[PDB]
Amino acid sequence: SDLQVCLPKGPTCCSRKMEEKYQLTARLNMEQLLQSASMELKFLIIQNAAVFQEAFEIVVRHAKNYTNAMFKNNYPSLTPQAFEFVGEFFTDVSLYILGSDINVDDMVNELFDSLFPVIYTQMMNPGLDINECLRGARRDLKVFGSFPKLIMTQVSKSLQVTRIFLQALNLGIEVINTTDHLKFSKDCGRMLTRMWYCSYCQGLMMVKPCGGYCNVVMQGCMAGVVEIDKYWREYILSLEELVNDMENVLLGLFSTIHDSIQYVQKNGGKLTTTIGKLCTLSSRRRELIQKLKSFINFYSALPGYICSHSPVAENDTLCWNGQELVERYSQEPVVSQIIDKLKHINQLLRTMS
Ligand SMILES: *[C@@H]1O[C@H](CO)[C@@H](O)[C@H](O)[C@H]1NC(C)=O
Ligand SMILES: *[C@@H]1O[C@H](CO)[C@@H](O)[C@H](O)[C@H]1NC(C)=O
Numbered sequence: 001s002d003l004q005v006c007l008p009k010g011p012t013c014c015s016r017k018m019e020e021k022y023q024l025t026a027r028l029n030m031e032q033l034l035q036s037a038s039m040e041l042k043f044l045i046i047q048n049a050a051v052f053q054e055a056f057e058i059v060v061r062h063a064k065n066y067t068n069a070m071f072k073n074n075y076p077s078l079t080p081q082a083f084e085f086v087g088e089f090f091t092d093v094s095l096y097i098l099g100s101d102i103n104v105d106d107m108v109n110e111l112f113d114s115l116f117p118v119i120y121t122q123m124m125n126p127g128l129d130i131n132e133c134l135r136g137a138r139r140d141l142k143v144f145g146s147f148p149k150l151i152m153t154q155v156s157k158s159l160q161v162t163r164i165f166l167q168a169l170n171l172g173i174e175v176i177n178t179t180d181h182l183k184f185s186k187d188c189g190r191m192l193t194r195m196w197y198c199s200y201c202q203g204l205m206m207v208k209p210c211g212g213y214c215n216v217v218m219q220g221c222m223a224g225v226v227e228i229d230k231y232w233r234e235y236i237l238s239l240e241e242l243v244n245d246m247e248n249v250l251l252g253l254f255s256t257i258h259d260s261i262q263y264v265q266k267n268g269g270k271l272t273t274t275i276g277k278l279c280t281l282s283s284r285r286r287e288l289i290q291k292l293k294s295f296i297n298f299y300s301a302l303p304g305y306i307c308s309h310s311p312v313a314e315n316d317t318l319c320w321n322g323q324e325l326v327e328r329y330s331q332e333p334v335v336s337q338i339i340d341k342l343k344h345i346n347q348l349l350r351t352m353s
Pocket of ligand 2 (some may be wrong): 173174177178181
């Protein structure tokens, strides 16, 4: 008589307060169903994100170790200072891989800025306050040739693809975790309450809602959610485009650095006088992608999941149509944030490869 959701066709066994209860369980039932649909995909990316993050850090640590080892072996006169700017470089390497605001060109530079004064003082002119004059002379006189720019492009290409690979996995975690927190319209909350519970208010014990009625209701409130599909697909294929490395580059840096130190030593005669006057991975991300491609239908199949895991009369016979038991059935802001972040990422993937 005073109900606001359950259309009272005949009498009704539930009051207004019982309509609250049914509306809140409708909310809770929807969130649980969405969360059950997204659990297995969420855990897949969470697993891989944790593994790949440690695997990359193992690579960076191994690359730092070997660069320090070739400094110990080939340039003992540059140690222990060598250990300081090598460690600072690879620390910034990791920090950049994990998404922090680090400038790759500033990394490579600062490395050669710190490396040149000790090369001059210990290898070229044996025999502290003039240090800043030497650091400026490194770049102003281009003592290292194209070696810094060579390393610059060599590592910026591989560190950018590794950084975006991690950023893409985490953002995938972020949007899939956002699905089961998706708040819906007030009209849908009433429709879901009608579809799932308002039959109990009419005194029915085993009646299930119609599969067709569930389809028009689900398509009702997932109209915005389903629009994410196109962008979620493009995210999957763009991620496949990137995987199809950074180890070989980072584990080759010593070689390039060592040759750069030979290069600056080749013109020492004129340089000293001028300055004196002046002063199994790839298998893992392949398996991840093949497992991620099984979830390309996630957003399109989502209304199908909610109806197929809720009790419905698929036959559309002897079912509940939201207001009565029939013989046959007749028949943005958060979502836009998901699409924006998907758009931003997809663009970022497509440009790398
Ligand atoms: C290798 O790296 C680990 C951790 O960075 C360090 O404890 C160890 O001393 C390194 N070994 C060599 C030979 O550089
Ligand atoms: C999922 O979302 C909830 C609430 O927004 C948040 O507390 C939680 O940390 C998120 N989990 C992940 C793995 O992002």
